[PDB]
Design a protein around this ligand. Structure first.
Ligand SMILES: C[C@H]1CCCN1C(=O)c1ccc2cnc(NC3CCN(S(C)(=O)=O)CC3)nc2c1
Length: 290
C-alpha cells in the first residue's frame, strides 16, 4: 500500500488531492500517486478497465483508512508546460494536428463506453518523448468527491467549460469534451487561451462576444436553460479567420464544428476523426526538455 511506494517529489496540488511522483517498491515502477482525502469505489473500478493508448492508465486503486489512493502511469510533461516552452515559436502545425487527432481517438473510445471526462484542460493532457498525448484524470460528475480542506486553495479554471454547463444544464453529454478540446486546439494554434474567463458570467460573456449571443435559431431551447437570462447582452458573431487567424480553412471548419453552441449539432469525436483536416496527419517527435 502506501508503505509499498517511495515518494519522489510532489508533482501537483488540487482541490481533490495531491499527486506525487513515486516508486513502487515491489515492481520498480515509477508512477503518479494521487492521494484523495475523504459507488465511488465502483465508478473508479470501472475506470480501471477503460484502457486505451491515449488514456493515462489507472494502474491500481488502493482503498485504506479514510484515504483513497489512485496510482497512475507516469508521464513526464503536460501540454501546459509544453505550450509555455513553445510560446516564442509555436507548436508546429503537424504536431498540433497529431495531438488533436490522438486526443479525439481517446475521446471517441471513452465516449463509446459512455464515459465523459468533463474537465479537459492543458494540465490533464500528458505527453511523452515518442509523440504521444494522453487524457488524464477523468472527472466523475455522477459519483466521487471528497474533502478539500487540507487541499490548498485552488481556483477552478473555467476557460474550457462548455456553454451548456455554464447555463446550468445538469444532464449534459459527451459534447462538453469536444467543446473543451476545441478550446485547447485554438490555444495551441494561437498561443493564447481562447476564452480566459475569471467568473462564470465572464466566461459566458467572453464566449458570446466571439461566437455571438446564442438564440433559438442556432440553439433550440437555449432560452429555457436554467441560468439563461433574457437580459443577456446581444453580441454579434465574429469570423474564425479573426479568431484563430494562422489556421487554414480545414482547421477553421473543424474548430467551428467543435464549438457549435447546440450540443446536438456539435461534432462527435468519431466524426471529427474523418474531417478533411486530418487528411495529412502524421506523428512527429516533439522537442521535449526534461
Ligand atoms: C493530471 C493532473 C491534474 C491534476 C490531477 N492530475 C493527476 O491526478 C495526474 C494523473 C496522472 C499523472 C501522470 N503523470 C504526471 N506527471 C506530471 C509530471 C510533471 N509535469 S510538468 C509540470 O509538465 O513537468 C506534469 C505531468 N502527472 C499526473 C497527474
Amino acid at each position: 500500500f502506501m508503505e509499498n511506494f517511495q515518494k519522489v517529489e510532489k508533482i501537483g496540488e488540487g482541490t481533490y488531492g495531491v499527486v506525487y511522483k513515486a516508486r513502487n517498491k515491489l515492481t520498480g515502477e515509477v508512477v503518479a500517486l494521487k492521494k484523495i482525502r475523504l459507488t465511488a469505489i465502483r465508478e473508479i473500478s470501472l475506470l480501471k478497465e477503460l484502457n486505451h493508448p491515449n488514456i493515462v492508465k489507472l494502474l491500481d486503486v488502493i482503498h485504506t483508512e479514510n484515504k483513497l489512493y489512485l496510482v497512475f502511469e507516469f508521464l513526464h510533461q503536460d501540454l501546459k508546460k509544453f505550450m509555455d516552452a513553445s510560446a516564442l515559436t509555436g507548436i508546429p502545425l503537424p504536431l498540433i494536428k497529431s495531438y488533436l487527432f490522438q486526443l479525439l481517438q481517446g475521446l471517441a473510445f471513452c465516449h463509446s463506453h459512455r464515459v465523459l471526462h468533463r474537465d479537459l484542460k492543458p494540465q490533464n493532457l500528458l505527453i511523452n518523448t515518442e509523440g504521444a498525448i494522453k487524457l488524464a484524470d477523468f472527472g466523475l460528475a455522477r459519483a466521487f468527491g471528497v474533502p478539500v480542506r487540507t487541499y490548498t486553495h485552488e481556483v477552478v479554471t473555467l476557460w474550457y467549460r462548455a456553454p451548456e454547463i455554464l447555463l446550468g444544464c445538469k444532464y449534459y453529454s459527451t459534447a462538453v469534451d469536444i467543446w473543451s478540446l476545441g478550446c485547447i486546439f485554438a490555444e495551441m494554434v494561437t498561443r493564447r487561451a481562447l476564452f480566459p474567463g475569471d467568473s462564470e458570467i465572464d466566461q459566458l460573456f467572453r464566449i458570446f462576444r466571439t461566437l455571438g449571443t446564442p438564440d433559438e435559431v442556432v440553439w433550440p431551447g437555449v432560452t429555457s436553460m436554467p441560468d439563461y437570462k433574457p437580459s443577456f447582452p446581444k453580441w454579434a458573431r465574429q469570423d474564425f479567420s479573426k479568431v484563430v487567424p494562422p489556421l487554414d480553412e480545414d482547421g477553421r471548419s473543424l474548430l467551428s464544428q467543435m464549438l457549435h453552441y447546440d450540443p446536438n449539432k456539435r461534432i462527435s469525436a468519431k466524426a471529427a476523426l474523418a474531417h478533411p483536416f486530418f487528411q495529412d496527419v502524421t506523428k512527429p517527435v516533439p522537442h521535449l526538455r526534461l
